[model samples]
Target: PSRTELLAEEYLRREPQKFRLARIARLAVPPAYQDVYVSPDAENELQAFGRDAAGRLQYRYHPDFVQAGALKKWQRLTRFAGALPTLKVATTADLRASGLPPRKVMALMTRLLHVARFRVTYGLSTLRQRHVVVDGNTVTFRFKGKHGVSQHKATSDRTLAANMQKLLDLPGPWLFQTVDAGGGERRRIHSTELNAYLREVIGPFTAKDFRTWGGTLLAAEYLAQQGTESSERQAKKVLVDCVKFVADDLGNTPAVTRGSYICPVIFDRYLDGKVLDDYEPRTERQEAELEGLTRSEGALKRMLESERT
Candidate 1:
């Protein structure tokens, strides 16, 4: 390995928060609770039961929490008023056993495997069918802004189209299509109810935590590429670009600002390790030393003497 590469690895160990550009493909496992393909029988049946004359599902029913046997302790979902527990059992067999149709289980089980993965959640009402754009290698998300209905976009892309195939399988419009267990169609999963969907296996969480994490993660990456941290113009440039990136990618003027967006604390920490090559933070000691040197060097000998005379 090159000496520089070895030093970089050592630096990463000391401060692991540094943005590593090496593993984005591996790290880019994001979701929005879009439907996964399920069997036609249970799905269609579930759909038929829920829809009214116009084909919108009446309502999303709340499941009773029986707390079967001695289930381990868990987190109460904060993003919801009901405060749902973080548990597993959303599969057809799992839900079927409980008389709950797992796929049609209504709330996203997220394959349970989705427990560790992060995703962004927004109201379907806020997202229009026309907002999402799909290029060969990347999928861009456009959200309607709150102010004057301004529009902004976030293009999440992969180096290879194959790398992003699974992420982009469904079209842009149905990221949170709310189909039920009997495979029935229903009303879309809006933000409030969406947050109540548990992280299942490993979280004391709902939608906001997951959604916040994913967008913040990507925003950090965007700043990482903004020409490594610096002072003077560079620092100002990085901060502006980062705020703008977070504004467009993580949220809009119309969306929830505090929860889903990256905070300054997060951006600052990552910025430390992200500075450019040969860069050094301006130190008070160095500044003081320079100041002292300048003081010693400047003496108005002849001019001052003439004025005194």
Candidate 2:
């Protein structure tokens, strides 16, 4: 029951204060540049003005510009700072507020917040009522796309069935639904509202940042948990799962990356395989050198068996 208890307590502690904060932090930015400003400096400045001044000053700081800025900032900061910038540090009080043991809280925060950007890049969305799929301990997603939805088996022993059951038992179709501003039976959450809430509490960050962080966290965690000699196939599987989850959240297909429905190497990468490095086919002779490696099913099986052994 500790898992349930932890979930409840985290929801309560985080939802009311931290969650509120996070929501404000996310939605706090103005619509024009909401997705652009994801850094602490930007966030801190945003907190001061309730919007991103960089975006305001330079209309060029649009989504694409912001992404470029983020990449540049990442290069500069990681090269110099020696640590990734996080929304907030995991503190004793934060853990206590979530009613979790300090270690668990730390772990949760690390997984949820610290690695959010990678998830965003892969296209993972924030957890929502509609996206959740609870089957026993496993909680999967019904993300948008041709891949349908990918399922993730819960790593923990505690089952989510009871909790989901309780949620389903509620009278309404929506989870945590309430009256909306327009009084048109809207799903209580609006993008702007959630962003506002996150801004107010979490200082500054956007919903997208959460996704990026989530993807990175999932990859890092998977790598850490996997035993030695884990094959590229296994590692790719985890990355694919993360990408699938993200794509679903974004309501896009995995093929979106290719600008076409028929994603060749891209889909393969999404399904636990690597991309080939063969390029520069100038002539027949050069074409001969274009042979690339395909995923080795036998190698994958052998590696899995080795893990069991």
Q: Quote the positional error of residue 280 for candidate 1 in Å.
A: 20
Judge candidate 2 against the unseen true structure and give its global Cα lDDT, from 0 to 1. Answer: 0.33
Instruction: Give the per-residue lDDT of model 1 (tens digit) for 63-165.
Output: 1122353221111111221111223223222333332232332333242112222233333333544555567765454554444333444344353223223
TM-score of 2: 0.34
Cα-based lDDT at residue 29, candidate 2: 44
Candidate 1: TM-score?
0.37
Q: After superposition, how far is residue 240 of candidate 2 from its true place, in Å?
A: 8.5
Please list the residue runs of candidate 2 whose C-alpha ends up more than 4 Å from where it truly belongs after superposition: 1-169, 179-187, 225-309
TM-score of each: 0.37, 0.34
The stretch of ten residues in a row with the least summed lDDT in candidate 2 is: 77-86
lDDT, model 1? 0.34
